[PDB]
């Protein structure tokens, strides 16, 4: 695409696990001569902080702000 070689973008639904620790996601294995890219985009959110469970794609549990 415009002189640069690219692989198709692949998508995953991610939430942080409770405990406020960073989320580990494994990088895809790139063909020889290409480098890894990543992007996170906003889907659902509230100001609940730790009092929530958004891990279901079909519903969102939001218990309010601490």
């Amino acid at each position: 695409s415009d002189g640069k070689t690219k692989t198709p973008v692949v998508s995953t639904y991610e939430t942080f696990q409770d405990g406020g620790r960073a989320k580990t996601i494994n990088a895809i294995e790139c063909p020889t001569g290409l480098n890894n890219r990543f992007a996170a985009v906003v889907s659902s959110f509230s100001t609940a902080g730790q009092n929530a469970n958004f891990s279901s794609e079909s519903a969102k549990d939001s218990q309010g702000t601490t």
């Binding site: 692989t7 198709p8 063909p31 020889t32 001569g33």
Partner: protein, 66 residues
Amino acid sequence: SLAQTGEIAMQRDGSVAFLEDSELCWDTAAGSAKSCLSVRYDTVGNKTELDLKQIDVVSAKGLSFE
């Protein structure tokens, strides 16, 4: 003396394999411009590549990758 050269005929049963780095080409309406493709190996990658970069666009119906 016979010499098994590149002249060996490709069979419709596929029992005969192409030679390394040989190119399968099409006559195109560009006149005498050939639009080729091949299966190359990059030892500096240990990966097999199906190189279509001589063809401008590849148009598929369904398409899947891993």
